[PDB]
Amino acid sequence: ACGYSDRVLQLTLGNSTITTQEAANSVVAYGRWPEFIRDDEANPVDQPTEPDVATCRFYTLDTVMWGKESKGWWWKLPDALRDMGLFGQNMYYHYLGRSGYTVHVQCNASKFHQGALGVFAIPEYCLAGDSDKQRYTSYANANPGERGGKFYSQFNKDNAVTSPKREFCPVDYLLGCGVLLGNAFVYPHQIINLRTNNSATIVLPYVNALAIDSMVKHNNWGIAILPLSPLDFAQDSSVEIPITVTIAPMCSEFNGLRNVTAPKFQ
Amino acid sequence: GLPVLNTPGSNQYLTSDNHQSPCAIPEFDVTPPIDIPGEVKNMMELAEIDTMIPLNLESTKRNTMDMYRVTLSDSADLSQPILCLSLSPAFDPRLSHTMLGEVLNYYTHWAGSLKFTFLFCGSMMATGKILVAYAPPGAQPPTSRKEAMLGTHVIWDLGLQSSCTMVVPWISNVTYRQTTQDSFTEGGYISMFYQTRIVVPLSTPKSMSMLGFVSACNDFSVRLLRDTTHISQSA
Amino acid sequence: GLPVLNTPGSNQYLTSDNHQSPCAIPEFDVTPPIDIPGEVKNMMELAEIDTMIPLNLESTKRNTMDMYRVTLSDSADLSQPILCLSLSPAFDPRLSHTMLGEVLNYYTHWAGSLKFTFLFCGSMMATGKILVAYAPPGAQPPTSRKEAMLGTHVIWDLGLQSSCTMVVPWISNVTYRQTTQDSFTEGGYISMFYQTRIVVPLSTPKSMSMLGFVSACNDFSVRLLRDTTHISQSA
Amino acid sequence: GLPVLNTPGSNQYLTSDNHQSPCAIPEFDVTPPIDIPGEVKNMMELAEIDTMIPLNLES
Amino acid sequence: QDSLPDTKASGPAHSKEVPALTAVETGATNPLAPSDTVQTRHVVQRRSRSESTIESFFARGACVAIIEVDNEQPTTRAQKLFAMWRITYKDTVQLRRKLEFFTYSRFDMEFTFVVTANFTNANNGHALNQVYQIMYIPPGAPTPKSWDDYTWQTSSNPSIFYTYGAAPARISVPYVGLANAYSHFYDGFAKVPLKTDANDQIGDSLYSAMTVDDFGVLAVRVVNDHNPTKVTSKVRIYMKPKHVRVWCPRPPRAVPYYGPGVDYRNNLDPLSEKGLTTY
Amino acid sequence: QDSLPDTKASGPAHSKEVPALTAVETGATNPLAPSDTVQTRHVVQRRSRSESTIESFFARGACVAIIEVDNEQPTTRAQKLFAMWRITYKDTVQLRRKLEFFTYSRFDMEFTFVVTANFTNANNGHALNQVYQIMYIPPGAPTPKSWDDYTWQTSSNPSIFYTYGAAPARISVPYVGLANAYSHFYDGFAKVPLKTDANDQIGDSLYSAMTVDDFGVLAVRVVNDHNPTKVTSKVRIYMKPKHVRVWCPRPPRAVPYYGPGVDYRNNLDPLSEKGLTTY
Amino acid sequence: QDSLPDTKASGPAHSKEVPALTAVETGATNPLAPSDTVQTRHVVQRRSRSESTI
Amino acid sequence: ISEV
Amino acid sequence: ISEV
Amino acid sequence: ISEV
Amino acid sequence: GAQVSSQKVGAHENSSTINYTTINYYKDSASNAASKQDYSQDPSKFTEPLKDVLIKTAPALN
Amino acid sequence: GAQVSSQKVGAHENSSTINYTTINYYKDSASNAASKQDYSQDPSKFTEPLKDVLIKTAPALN
Amino acid sequence: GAQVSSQKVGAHENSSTINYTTINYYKDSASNAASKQDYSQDPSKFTEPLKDVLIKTAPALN
Numbered sequence A: 001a002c003g004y005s006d007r008v009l010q011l012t013l014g015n016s017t018i019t020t021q022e023a024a025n026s027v028v029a030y031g032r033w034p035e036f037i038r039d040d041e042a043n044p045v046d047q048p049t050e051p052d053v054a055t056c057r058f059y060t061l062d063t064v065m066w067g068k069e070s071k072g073w074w075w076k077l078p079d080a081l082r083d084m085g086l087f088g089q090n091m092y093y094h095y096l097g098r099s100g101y102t103v104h105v106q107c108n109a110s111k112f113h114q115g116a117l118g119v120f121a122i123p124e125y126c127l128a129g130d131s132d133k134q135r136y137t138s139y140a141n142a143n144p145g146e147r148g149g150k151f152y153s154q155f156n157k158d159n160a161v162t163s164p165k166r167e168f169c170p171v172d173y174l175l176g177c178g179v180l181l182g183n184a185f186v187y188p189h190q191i192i193n194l195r196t197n198n199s200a201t202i203v204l205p206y207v208n209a210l211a212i213d214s215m216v217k218h219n220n221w222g223i224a225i226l227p228l229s230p231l232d233f234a235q236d237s238s239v240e241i242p243i244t245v246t247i248a249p250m251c252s253e254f255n256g257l258r259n260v261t262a263p264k265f266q
Numbered sequence B, C: 001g002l003p004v005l006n007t008p009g010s011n012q013y014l015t016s017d018n019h020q021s022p023c024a025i026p027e028f029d030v031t032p033p034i035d036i037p038g039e040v041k042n043m044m045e046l047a048e049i050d051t052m053i054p055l056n057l058e059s060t061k062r063n064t065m066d067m068y069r070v071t072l073s074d075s076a077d078l079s080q081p082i083l084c085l086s087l088s089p090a091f092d093p094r095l096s097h098t099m100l101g102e103v104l105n106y107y108t109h110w111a112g113s114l115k116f117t118f119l120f121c122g123s124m125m126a127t128g129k130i131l132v133a134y135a136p137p138g139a140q141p142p143t144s145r146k147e148a149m150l151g152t153h154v155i156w157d158l159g160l161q162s163s164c165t166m167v168v169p170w171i172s173n174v175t176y177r178q179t180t181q182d183s184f185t186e187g188g189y190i191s192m193f194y195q196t197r198i199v200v201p202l203s204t205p206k207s208m209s210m211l212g213f214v215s216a217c218n219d220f221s222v223r224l225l226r227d228t229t230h231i232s233q234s235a
Numbered sequence D: 001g002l003p004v005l006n007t008p009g010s011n012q013y014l015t016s017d018n019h020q021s022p023c024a025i026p027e028f029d030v031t032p033p034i035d036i037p038g039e040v041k042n043m044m045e046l047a048e049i050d051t052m053i054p055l056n057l058e059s
Numbered sequence E, F: 001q002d003s004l005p006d007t008k009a010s011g012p013a014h015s016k017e018v019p020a021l022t023a024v025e026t027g028a029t030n031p032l033a034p035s036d037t038v039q040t041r042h043v044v045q046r047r048s049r050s051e052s053t054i055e056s057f058f059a060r061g062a063c064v065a066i067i068e069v070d071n072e073q074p075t076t077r078a079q080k081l082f083a084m085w086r087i088t089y090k091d092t093v094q095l096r097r098k099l100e101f102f103t104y105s106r107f108d109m110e111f112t113f114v115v116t117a118n119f120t121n122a123n124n125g126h127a128l129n130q131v132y133q134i135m136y137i138p139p140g141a142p143t144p145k146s147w148d149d150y151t152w153q154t155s156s157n158p159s160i161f162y163t164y165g166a167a168p169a170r171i172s173v174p175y176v177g178l179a180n181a182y183s184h185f186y187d188g189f190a191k192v193p194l195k196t197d198a199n200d201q202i203g204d205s206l207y208s209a210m211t212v213d214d215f216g217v218l219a220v221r222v223v224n225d226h227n228p229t230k231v232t233s234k235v236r237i238y239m240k241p242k243h244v245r246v247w248c249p250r251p252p253r254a255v256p257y258y259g260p261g262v263d264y265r266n267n268l269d270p271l272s273e274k275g276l277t278t279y
Numbered sequence G: 001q002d003s004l005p006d007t008k009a010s011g012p013a014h015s016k017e018v019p020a021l022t023a024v025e026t027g028a029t030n031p032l033a034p035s036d037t038v039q040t041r042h043v044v045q046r047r048s049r050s051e052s053t054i
Numbered sequence H, I, J: 001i002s003e004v
Numbered sequence K, L, M: 001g002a003q004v005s006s007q008k009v010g011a012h013e014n015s016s017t018i019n020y021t022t023i024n025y026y027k028d029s030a031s032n033a034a035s036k037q038d039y040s041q042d043p044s045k046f047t048e049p050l051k052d053v054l055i056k057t058a059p060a061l062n
């Protein structure tokens, strides 16, 4: 009653609040809300750290621009948040950490623009690489942080054998991993179709073959945003609109405290 | 010594069988399960999920992102079909590689109702009415809206609800159809036409994409497990 | 390990056996039955259906439609037999290929009562009386009505009821006769004679056909399943 | 003769298996146990005993 | 109890009831018994129709196919290192004729495999025991191009691995038809020619045929690598219908079969010559 | 009972309820049935999804490895008197593709061993029946350097002794994973490179790989001493997952596998050409 | 049932009880558990010593 | 058991 | 025994 | 029988 | 699950009702043997498919 | 320890509920055959993972 | 003489307590298989063979 709607939402976590007046409901991956490790599913015996509001708030990543040649963007979690305030600090001070996430993707335009973004949350998003060499993508390259990576329209094999790039070569219609993109819809997702909605909101549970794991060694979720239908406006052949990704860690807990992990990203 | 008599079948090995056998690592302490999210109980659950159709397999469009995109425009030839496709969910090149098509290529026989959902990806200022149809087998595959009108159909009106769903009802002579191509167990024809036309105002794109989706209605089932042609390996 | 001892017969294969074996397509979803009209529970049901006898296997008549036609006429030689046949239901060339004869050629032994029915296919203005007979084995096969009269017989009077039935009662020494020819298990003789004669008026055909039929009475049974000589194939 | 069908695995020998077999010295009069001190029920009992570490493996 | 009806004692008659006369034009067979036309004694009948029941009539394993497969050194010309058979009861005549007394049937099928082998040539040393793989390829599945290519991996197809000298292999198959019954006869086509068709080949079909592959194939091979000397083997396939039901009886085949349809060609003269008045 | 829902009789509509329209942007699939958009009759449904259950889909033994081992006179150069295989479902493509419709799995595993042999050379006398030893070496255990060295004593490792010609050997293995489920996909590394590392080789790892030896190896040998003539044998390994559970579905592999990871190399063009308005 | 003992939740300490110190000269092994020297959470243990039985 |  |  |  | 039925005993030894035992080993009914205890039916649907069925001692045509 | 269950009988002989018997011979459950009596579930967690699940006849967007 | 016991079921099928049956065929116990249901004991006789056993939070020496 009163005047409420599927399209209008407020998300509040910690000292952060998001409003949206043009949503398309919201997704909870596999019907499961984030939760803490139960005593009967626990494995590390040391008392956990639960930083709560200090880490379970919305961190906004650097904005990316969507233009007519944009092939697609990808992120990995927890990697995109490694440098985000006290969350990143907790991640690097402990051997173990689990966390769920609320992902909120933002992209508005006008009643006259056109285009549709496919936003997909993928458990264990193993991407493909550069080379003749199998499973050779270097740690530093596999992990772009906040920056994320991109998709390509075709497979360019990094030829230079002698001094290898050890990079991914994610081809768009193959979801960067040897399968057809049209089937990516079996994964938890939403579509930002500019005539319908400004944004997508997906709530991710912790998914893993384990109750808790090493966040520095392993990404649990991959976020893939691909243009299912290209951006278009009026007759202007060089339109560009911003895509902004805001993410919040949820029910975060950490085990195995010691000196801080300082990975080498060069 | 219990007197026994060995029957035929003795000492054979059937790949398809179900028997007990000795455990090679006795008394092993098994890691318990934890409640992982996303559990699947039946391959038909996957076929019920909407996945995007490669509707556009023309020379330069196929094996590209444009294979997923059907172009609608305000200046299209209204007498012509927007798209034409056969109801062969595991065999037709547009359907065979969808999640539904892929599960069906591991089985020999399919039965049940299917549903196609179409998404308008044009601007909000764009309008239009589209007729989408299904012709059960036995006659000339529809070439005009006049002909298509006469079979099972839906008239989709574009508006705030972005998408439309046409259910293809299970209408068959046989109780189970085949997953391969075969005139005897054929499914019929799907076609789309403009009912009125795409209309836009000025300062608006005159052309836009339509994305298509397919999934199984809850009466759908499959049988006779078999190997797929969708994968292989070299010597 | 249960101590067992393998007996003779072990690892053999008997064509005639009845054993369980692994199912090669486990958990298959079987198409249910529907109530189809015309279900058969026993091959003897077919032998109880009247089928037409090839009574006329003469040189130019056999393997032709005339093999089914016996000519009766008002000018026939009344002392002579209309037809003469042996009671060997699976072996006699006139009986062996009837539906009864055919089911019996898949078995070695037969027992029970048979019945022959004759149909007058002449004009309504035609009349006559016919004696049809059965002689149990052991004596001279009847050559005259005088002789035939003395055995089991029926005097058929032609009229509005077009047909007549003679039952050949089970009269045998053995409990089961053989389906092949054999003097020891022989069935006897069937013969037909004019009792008066065919009489027609003027402007009427003086000649006409009689069709014959055979089927098993409800006491008929068979045993020892075997292969038929009525079919074969080349190298 | 009970109709039987031999399954795969038949006539194999698995080192890891657990089956009955004929006794080669039937009716043997077995020497009874006596209560010997120091009985062990599980190899993990031994791992719970403190033993001295070779902490210094220099040349 | 299953014995046939007893014969009743029946005496003389002088009456208006005439069982002996009838009219076959009606389409009916006259229900007569010996006591309707002759004097009968009372017989307590003990005979029964136990062996002519549908199940009993078919309760026998019949030879429907002989598959030949060789095991020899892979040369570069057409060989038989593997073979394929379309599953049918029609390459043979005996079971086909029995099954065809009926229009429709419904049953489970029992397959028994007899495997025999021999040495082809006078002498090149000998052969260690062979294991044979019999793989079922249902319509749609990749068929083998080679005796040891990837299709023989058989991950989802059912396969039997048979060892030479072991008891004949045996498996069971459910009722697998697309209809509610198997059609022993199909008066129709899989395609209709339409007036609007481009060539008139589009709408052409074989008369009486339903699906192109019916029930798929059995692919047979020797899993052993080749010996220096050649071994030739034959896999004989015995078919037995069990838990059988049949509908709409038909007259038995009277002339030699000429292919899968009802077509006839020659020996159209089944019946012997016999004199009309000759016993 | 397991039959699918019945079709309800459904008649004409003129209403404000519009099942036919929807918004897929939501992330949801529209729950429609034929009766929502067409007039339907009542059908009492009897069909069921019995054969597409997770267990039924995987309930088939698939070929995952072909191990070749020779039995011949021990000469002084590299021979195959024994062989070792790393246990995996990835040297083959068929079962791998089926297992990979899912991210995580949990199951017991059934291993069936088909052993075939032949004579290599035209002639040097013959061979008495061979017994094969298949030993499991879990990570950590001493591996064999020689076909008859001390490791084959197998005091704590499980071994199968198989006799040629006997029924194919079969054993069962429990769920043996270090985690609560087997990961069919692992988006990570076994080592992180740290800023303080000496060489930057220390922290290097294969992408997607977890432990180095995963589940160990199968060591295969002929226990027989060599005949004067040479015998070559192949041990074919069939894998069947049983008592199976699977989590988080994934799109099937659409292009040929290129190694153990998700990497692709060529034949990246899965789809056929077909006209937009062509049936 | 054969599973190993559960880990008890254990919190901070400031006391005269010193489990951490001992004297191995006695011939005895110190019976300590993680909760005696660190803060522990409650873990419901399911692991067992089934395969290391004699 | 089930004795008919 | 245990009859389900 | 003896069910433990 | 042992099913016990009676044999129709033909030749009897010089020694009443004799039985045989059956147990299905497999889950799929197709795997099963043939029971061979089969029910018989009327020939009527083939021997007399008449709309007005008439008694044999009366005129077939009237 | 004999476990008795019912067969889902597809093609029926001309002869009701038919059973099959099972006995586990080994101590380790991994040694056991597959029961194949499996429970099915809702597609919902994949087909409708919405926070506010809506009824099909109402507007998906409102 | 059939002995029925429970399996400690590790990986469970999508279908509770599962059993296995055992029967000794031979008179000599040496012929028998291993039951593998084994009882565990205290490490105390090895880890604490002290005459005066002391509680861990008190001084070992006093």
Ligand SMILES: CCOC(=O)c1ccc(OCCCC2CCN(c3ccc(C)nn3)CC2)cc1
Binding pocket: C024, C025, E087, E088, E089, E090, E109, E111, E134, E135, E136, E158, E159, E160, E171, E173, E176, E182, E214, E215
């Ligand atoms: C007109 C042709 O013949 C028939 O109509 C007819 C003939 C046979 C028939 O039986 C079923 C045929 C399909 C079966 C054939 C044998 N099958 C298998 C399956 C696995 C293995 C290893 N071996 N055989 C599985 C499917 C059903 C109908």
Ligand SMILES: CCOC(=O)c1ccc(OCCCC2CCN(c3ccc(C)nn3)CC2)cc1
Binding pocket: B024, B025, F087, F088, F089, F090, F109, F111, F134, F135, F136, F158, F159, F160, F171, F173, F176, F182, F214, F215
């Ligand atoms: C990614 C690679 O493959 C897998 O993840 C995968 C593949 C196989 C698998 O099964 C379990 C593997 C370990 C088993 C392998 C076979 N084992 C044995 C043990 C004894 C004998 C004689 N034979 N085999 C014991 C341990 C478990 C997981």
Ligand SMILES: *C(=O)CCCCCCCCCCCCC
Binding pocket: H001, I001, K001, K002, K023, K024, K025, K026, L002, L004, L021, L022, L023
């Ligand atoms: C019903 O069958 C309960 C009684 C069982 C008696 C013993 C059965 C002996 C055979 C075991 C059959 C196992 C078949 C898979």
Ligand SMILES: *C(=O)CCCCCCCCCCCCC
Binding pocket: I001, J001, L001, L002, L023, L024, L025, L026, M002, M004, M021, M022, M023
């Ligand atoms: C429960 O199973 C009690 C009834 C036992 C019936 C006889 C079992 C016959 C098979 C013996 C199995 C021994 C397996 C190690």
Ligand SMILES: *C(=O)CCCCCCCCCCCCC
Binding pocket: C002, C003, J001, M001, M002, M023, M024, M025, M026
């Ligand atoms: C206790 O065991 C009484 C029940 C017996 C059930 C049938 C046993 C089947 C196996 C016979 C074993 C004979 C061993 C020498």
